[PDB]
Amino acid sequence: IPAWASGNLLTQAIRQQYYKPIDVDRMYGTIDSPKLEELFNKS
Amino acid sequence: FTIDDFDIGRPLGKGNVYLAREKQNKFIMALKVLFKSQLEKEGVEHQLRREIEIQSHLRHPNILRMYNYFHDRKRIYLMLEFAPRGELYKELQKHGRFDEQRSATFMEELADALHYCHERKVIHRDIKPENLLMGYKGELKIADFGWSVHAPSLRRRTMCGTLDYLPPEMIEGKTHDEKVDLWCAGVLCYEFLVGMPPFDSPSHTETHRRIVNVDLKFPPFLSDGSKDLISKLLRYHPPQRLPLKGVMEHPWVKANSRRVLPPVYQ
Numbered sequence: 001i002p003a004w005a006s007g008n009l010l011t012q013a014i015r016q017q018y019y020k021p022i023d024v025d026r027m028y029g030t031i032d033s034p035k036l037e038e039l040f041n042k043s
Numbered sequence: 044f045t046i047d048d049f050d051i052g053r054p055l056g057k058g059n060v061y062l063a064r065e066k067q068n069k070f071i072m073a074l075k076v077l078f079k080s081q082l083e084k085e086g087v088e089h090q091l092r093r094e095i096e097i098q099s100h101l102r103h104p105n106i107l108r109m110y111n112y113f114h115d116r117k118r119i120y121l122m123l124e125f126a127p128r129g130e131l132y133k134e135l136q137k138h139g140r141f142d143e144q145r146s147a148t149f150m151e152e153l154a155d156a157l158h159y160c161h162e163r164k165v166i167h168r169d170i171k172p173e174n175l176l177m178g179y180k181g182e183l184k185i186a187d188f189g190w191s192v193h194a195p196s197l198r199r200r201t202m203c204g205t206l207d208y209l210p211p212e213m214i215e216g217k218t219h220d221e222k223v224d225l226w227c228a229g230v231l232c233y234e235f236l237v238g239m240p241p242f243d244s245p246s247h248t249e250t251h252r253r254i255v256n257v258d259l260k261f262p263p264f265l266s267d268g269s270k271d272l273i274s275k276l277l278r279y280h281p282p283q284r285l286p287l288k289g290v291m292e293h294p295w296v297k298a299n300s301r302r303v304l305p306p307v308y309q
């Protein structure tokens with residue numbers, strides 16, 4: 001278990017994420033996704 | 044995305060869901076990992092397609108966000124909002140029952156999220172504590188859309204959900220609509236405050252009987268306000284159930300809720 005994923009380092013990162021939200025619509029919602037009809041086909 | 048775009052932290056739940064960190068943004072999320080071969084063997088491909096299609100298009104502070112998804116040779120990965128306070132059902136079990144402030148806050152959040160869904164003709168159909176997670180400040184997050192349906196025009200027929208939460212119209216084999224979620228919200232409010240669902244019985248037939256008779260028996264410790272809200276949701280006739288806007292405006296909800304909207308970008 002990496003340091004970032006436990007104890008105080010995690011708590012701190014989580015708090016920071018709540019109070020400083022990132023633009024998830026741009027950062028993740030604009031990036032291409034596989035077609036739902038492709039999910040069970042070749043990758 | 045690929046799996047190498049993420050630092051895997053630890054398993055969160057076995058079903059597998061992992062606490063993960065997206066490398067370039069140092070952004071902590073949950074990664075749900077599903078096996079393609081198992082999904083095909085079990086025959087649940089279209090079921091999964093539908094769940095992803097519904098959840099990935101919902102954006103509300105009290106609905107667990109699906110940021111994106113990707114796949115490789117053997118697996119499908121769902122990039123999900125991390126709910127740091129975890130499972131609501133575990134918190135309920137730990138405490139036995141919630142106080143009025145906690146319950147009213149959850150009810151306001153639930154009604155808001157369900158209103159958002161219903162405005163898009165999405166019916167949830169399985170509201171219960173086990174399908175809810177909790178955010179950084181304890182905010183309700185609808186986590187799971189396993190029984191959900193986009194129902195724009197046709198009334199529905201499928202019996203679905205969870206025994207203690209089933210509305211009369213499902214049990215009786217009638218068609219149903221979005222008002223099923225209103226019934227389940229009433230059952231949920233009762234379970235929050237009491238610690239047991241209202242129609243709890245030794246047998247499925249006796250449970251069904253209690254539901255269709257709305258055999259509601261309030262414990263003495265409940266406030267008049269809480270009983271008023273529950274009674275107005277648990278109506279036999281779907282059109283008579285208190286609307287979601289009505290839940291949010293209910294005096295007991297107004298007097299007791301301590302709801303906080305999360306900070307938004309930016």
Ligand SMILES: CNC(=O)c1ccc(Nc2ncc(Br)s2)cc1
Nearest residue numbers: 055060073123124125126127129
């Ligand atoms: C032992 N697991 C936990 O304590 C736990 C489980 C789940 C959790 N949050 C989750 N967020 C999103 C999903 Br999807 S699960 C936080 C903490």
